[PDB]
């Protein structure tokens, strides 16, 4: 009932209208990062979106249904971040992901820096599939920000 695409997550609880994050509507389910909503209900126009699944450690949450995004970075190709910065038009940024190496294995990472409210912007492969969400990351030695490509389980 609500169109596929990328969406800003706004709140009026602070000064003015504030963008706290971004998310993806696909197959009837809204996908964003846990730290954006803390699992709170969302409104979409007149209707209400209720949380359905979430996990603080993965830093993901889905609304109206189970996590639907299952594409993954192929470990070789460039991707595009569809950055949706607060107050600014959506812009695609192409990049070759780096790698977060962890005890439990490797995931892609994108070394692109944006305001906090950009959290949740989707990362896409050349087919337009969302391979994860932007905004859970680290700051490295030279002071630059690097975000995991954070993907859920379908």
């Amino acid at each position: 009932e609500t169109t596929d695409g990328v969406y800003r997550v706004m709140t009026r609880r602070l000064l003015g209208s504030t963008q706290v994050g971004v998310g993806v509507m696909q197959e009837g389910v809204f996908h964003t990062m846990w730290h954006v909503t803390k699992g709170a209900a969302l409104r979409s126009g007149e209707g209400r979106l209720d949380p359905y699944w979430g996990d603080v450690k993965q830093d993901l949450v889905s609304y109206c249904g189970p996590w639907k995004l299952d594409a993954a970075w192929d470990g070789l190709s460039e991707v595009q971040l569809l950055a949706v910065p607060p107050g600014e038009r959506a812009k695609n940024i192409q990049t070759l992901p780096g790698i977060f190496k962890t005890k439990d294995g490797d995931i892609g990472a994108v070394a692109l820096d944006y305001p906090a409210g950009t959290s949740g912007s989707p990362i896409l492969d050349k087919c337009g599939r969302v391979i994860g969400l932007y905004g859970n990351g680290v700051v490295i030695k030279n002071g630059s920000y690097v975000s995991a490509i954070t993907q859920g389980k379908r």
């Binding site: 695409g5 409104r43 595009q80 959506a90 940024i93 990049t95 190496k101 692109l112 969302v130």
Partner: protein, 38 residues
């Protein structure tokens, strides 16, 4: 009370600018969902 506003289609852009490095980093993820550099 939070609300959502449509911002675009989800599509690859052929003319897109290309930027960003490809660092290979050892990280740890803790129970609180925070990454840190090992």
């Amino acid at each position: 009370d939070m609300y959502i506003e449509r911002a675009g289609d989800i599509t690859w852009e052929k003319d897109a600018e290309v930027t960003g490095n490809s660092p290979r980093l050892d990280v740890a993820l803790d129970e609180s969902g925070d990454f840190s550099l090992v």
